[PDB]
Amino acid sequence: GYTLERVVILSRHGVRSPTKQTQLMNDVTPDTWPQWPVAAGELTPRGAQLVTLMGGFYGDYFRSQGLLAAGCPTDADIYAQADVDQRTRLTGQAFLDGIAPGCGLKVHYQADLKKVDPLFHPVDAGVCKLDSTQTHKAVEERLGGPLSELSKRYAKPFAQMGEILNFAASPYCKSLQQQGKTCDFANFAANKITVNKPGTKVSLSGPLALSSTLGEIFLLQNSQAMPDVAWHRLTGEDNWISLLSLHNAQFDLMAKTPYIARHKGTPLLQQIETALVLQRDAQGQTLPLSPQTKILFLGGHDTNIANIAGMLGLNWQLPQQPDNTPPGGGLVFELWQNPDNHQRYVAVKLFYQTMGQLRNAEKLDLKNNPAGRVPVAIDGCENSGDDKLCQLDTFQKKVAQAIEPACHI
Question: Where would you find the membrane-spanning parts of this chain (predicted)?
Fold first, then answer.
């Protein structure tokens, strides 16, 4: 077919413990949240193992495509840059361990682990600011109305989440009833967006935000192979899809909303595009990539993937993976060249482990049990053929149009 020339993987970190267990998260259920074997927000050992399995699949796939030779690549061939978080650094390392076992590759990352990496969090870092009014306006435009619409749009998932929590028996519900309120989970509080004064943080609070977090946690519990997921009250693929639709909706609103996405994702989009075509001195190419670079692995977060998706108009649904930005899942950019006419193409795929592949820690390979690999259509691109190929020149213009120039690094 075509020749796979270069790949950039924007990977979410692997399975992690919840980053935060708020009073609200405790109060919305009478049940006890299962504890995790690692500190909050850290990649679990099982998370690492799953990422390594995924790295083995990547290795299998890229070698089958001739992009990697057999044997050990070097940093010249494969570069893994991770965010400063432990979860992303170890995800990058687990990726290298799986794609190149015994090859001594080491994940790279900003040396100062104490500060945000502006590649992964430019807004947090202060590279550019979100305007509160534009942010509220952009999110509502994205939603098609004010956040109060969410309780109607997601009434069934919200009710489902309330049932899974046994919200009606929760301390939060008794507090609501104390105040003469009903225990309508969808409306236990207002959905509020808060941009802090400096414009470096945007927060969603309220039922959607909480439900996004809780749904993700259930999925992480499930992905961790925990024995009790959601107190055994969450089973069935559609129920998983439905419940996680709250999470995906939250990520759509708070990370895919182009205004937000372009401010938070511009350095990553520029890093992805410049690494993909290997324009090593281009703006936004921040890494010491070798001219021989075949794979750039970016160890980031679900928000990063969603920001990129928002910037490029990417929308997907993953068979057997209700989280659109699943643990260890990678937004994979592939540079293809048609040997017959030398036309070059960009393909975007979401590589991911299904729920079962995660939960059962299944060995991934090409013939028996591949990772999921969902082609993703790009706004403004040719989206040609079943794999939604974009002509390279078209992809580069789309990237140039999607970036917020004030947000580059």
Answer: none
Residues identified as active-site: 13, 302
Which one is the CATH code of 3-128+258-407: 3.50.50.60, 3.90.1150.10, 1.10.1740.10, 3.40.50.1240? 3.40.50.1240
Give CA–CA dist 123/255, Å, rounded.
12
Kindly state which CATH superfamily the domain 132-254 is placed in: Phosphoglycerate mutase-like (3.40.50.1240)
What is the C-alpha separation between 80 and 207, in angstroms, rounded? Answer: 36
Dihedral sign for Cα 32, 33, 36, 40, please.
negative
> Do the first three CATH levels of 3-128+258-407 and 132-254 match, i.e. the same topology?
yes
Q: CA-CA distance, 135 to 145, in Å (whole number)? A: 13
What was the elucidation method?
X-ray
Token pair, residue 18, equals: 């919840």
What are the extents of the domains in the chain?
A: 3-128+258-407, 132-254
269: nearest Cα among 91, 168, 395: 395
Nearest residue to 338 via CA among 5, 2, 65: 2
Beta bridge partners of 202: 195
- Alpha carbon separation from 314 to 89, 249, 257, 272 (Å, rounded): 26, 14, 11, 15
CA distance linking residue 287 with residue 158, whole number of Å: 43
β-sheet bridge partners, residue 330: 11, 351
Please report the resolution in angstroms: 1.9
Q: Distance (Å, rounded) from C-alpha 119 to C-alpha 320?
A: 31
Helix H or strand E segment including 310: helix 302-312
| Number of neighbouring beta carbons within 10 Å of residue 223 | 29
One-character DSSP codes across 238-290: HHHHHHHHHHHHHHIIIIISHHHHHHHHHHHHHHHHHHHHT-TTSTT--S---
Amino acid symbol at 280 = R
Q: What residues pair up with 345 in beta bridges, in sequence order?
A: 336, 391
Neighbouring C-beta atoms of residue 279, cutoff 10 Å = 14
Tokens, residue 38? 């690692």
Burial class from Cβ neighbours inside 10 Å (0-12, 13-18, 19+) for residue 209 reads buried
Q: How far is CA 200 from CA 127, 263, 299, in A?
A: 9, 10, 22
